[PDB]
Amino acid sequence: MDVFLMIRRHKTTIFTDAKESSTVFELKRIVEGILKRPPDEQRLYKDDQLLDDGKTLGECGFTSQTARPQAPATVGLAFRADDTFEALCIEPFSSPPELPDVMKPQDSGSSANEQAVQ
């Protein structure tokens, strides 16, 4: 019945809320309000995969076990125009002490610089 969803973007993450039986189309509206992107030049990703707006959170993969106050759901939003990308790689905010979204080893990478985006 209810499910918590979240959109993922580098340094940018939006907490989105919707009903498991709502409609990927409804969650899409939040993007046009935060990123201002319509259901055309934008793509969603769920569970290391691509989100399908042809199904609902429950008929897509969320129900009440992969989205809630205990375990929220994250979607990757990327816009493809000619040759550009956005999501795909979710840059996690600052969390070197705890909240290790993954096994971030951090062996080396700080006082050496690496390409750097600008």
């Binding site: 340094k11 907490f15 600052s94 969390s95």
Partner: protein, 96 residues
């Protein structure tokens, strides 16, 4: 309705208005008695709260919403020598 919170680090996080209404100050900012810039609406700005901290307290912003009508378990957030120090003035600065 949702609001975006920015950390002095550069990270950004947005929580539904009601989800952010758990700050006591973020809700008043959505319409605080201030001027209106061509942009920047329903957003929060903390010049003294890092990204990892604004998200820490933010979890209670949503946890408190569904726990406000519970009154049975209501666990407690984990605190240790690594995270929680900033919440001292930041967590308290965000009302309850």
């Amino acid at each position: 309705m949702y609001v975006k919170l920015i950390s002095s680090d550069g990270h950004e996080f947005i929580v539904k208005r009601e989800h952010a209404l758990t700050s006591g100050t973020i809700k008043a900012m959505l319409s605080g008695p201030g001027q209106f810039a061509e942009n920047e609406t329903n957003e929060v700005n903390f010049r003294e709260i890092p990204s990892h901290v604004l998200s820490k307290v933010c979890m209670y912003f949503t946890y408190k919403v569904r726990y406000t009508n519970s009154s049975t378990e209501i666990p407690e957030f984990p605190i240790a020598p690594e995270i929680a120090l900033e919440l001292l003035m930041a967590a308290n600065f965000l009302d309850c």
